[PDB]
Amino acid sequence: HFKEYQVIGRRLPTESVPEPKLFRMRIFASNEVIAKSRYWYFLQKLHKVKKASGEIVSINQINEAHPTKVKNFGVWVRYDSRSGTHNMYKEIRDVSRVAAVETLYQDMAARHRARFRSIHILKVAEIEKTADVKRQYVKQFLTKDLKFPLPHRVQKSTKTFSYKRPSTFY
């Protein structure tokens, strides 16, 4: 389970160059230590720096603004593959950004066999207005007065032997 982290760094203040530009980014991780490590990994790719040349100035947990309102998120993803890296845009309906990126990571592993080290989360944005929601499987749930059943339900047994011949009604 994830957590969003604002992690900043400004390549250690030396002589003749005081107070550098403080490079800020939002990092999804499980804890603070992984977030820090991922941040250094991203910095080495965005420009030519190193872990020893800089310093983590502030690490902060970004709580979700309204964890009760169901949102329509659109996530820009890129990831290393069997071949070269490539962009991807998946649309996710969820309550929070942490939970939406969670469902993405499990889906990316499920459909593309990409682990945690491959995936570069670019930008997670709310899609404010519907009918601008591009993906059809998300637009599937944005219809008026959606009433759908769950036919054929399993009844979870606590014992080995039953005396009914179970009824999978709903």
């Binding site: 009844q155 047994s157 080995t160 032997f161 039953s162 005396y163 179970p166 999978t168």
Partner: protein
């Protein structure tokens, strides 16, 4: 919980069925699967048939009277599915199997007796709708077994007698359920309610 435990091996899944019977034994519980024919597997017919058939192709080259005894009867067909699931060459195994009993159809004194099911091996629950399963009655027949019909016949008749019994039952039940309802609101009654019963 009981001395014996009669399973209705219908619409079940040989595997998950056997595996839930197997251990059950080793733990000293007596068990008696019935209606074996009506048992189920998983996968478009042909599929299984092709499967078994390759098994039916393995025989002690030099003397085939010595090699893998290929059994048709849905029972045996499902006793081998439970056997190889229990250290059956040791003593603790032989002793286990010995308290197991597979029956194709339902004979006495099992008939006139309660018969359970195994949710965790129920095809309806386990399987996903719209996915070919392969009854056991068929496979068997189309490979050697030759008593499919009889049982069938002897099974239909075994139900009838069953039905009637019931009918009689539903009645006597109603009668008791109606008398009870009429016993409601009678100090005693009233009270029980407060103590759930």
């Amino acid at each position: 919980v009981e001395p014996v435990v009669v399973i209705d091996g219908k619409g079940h899944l040989v595997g998950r069925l056997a595996s839930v019977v197997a251990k059950q034994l080793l733990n000293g519980q007596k068990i008696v699967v019935v209606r074996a024919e009506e048992l189920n597997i998983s996968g478009e017919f042909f599929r299984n048939k092709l499967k078994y058939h390759d098994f039916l192709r393995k025989a002690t080259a030099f003397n085939k009277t010595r090699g893998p005894f290929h059994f048709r009867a849905p029972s045996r067909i499902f006793y081998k599915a439970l056997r190889g699931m229990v250290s059956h060459k040791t003593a603790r195994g032989k002793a286990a199997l010995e308290r197991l009993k597979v029956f194709e159809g339902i004979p006495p004194p099992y008939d006139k007796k309660k018969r359970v099911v195994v949710p965790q091996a129920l095809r309806v629950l386990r399987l996903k709708p719209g996915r070919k399963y392969t009854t056991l009655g068929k496979l068997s027949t189309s490979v050697g077994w030759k008593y499919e019909d009889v049982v069938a016949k002897l099974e239909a008749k075994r139900k009838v007698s069953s039905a009637e019994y019931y009918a009689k039952k539903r009645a006597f039940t109603k009668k008791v359920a109606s008398a009870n309802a009429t016993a409601a609101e009678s100090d005693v009654a009233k009270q029980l309610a407060a103590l759930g019963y």
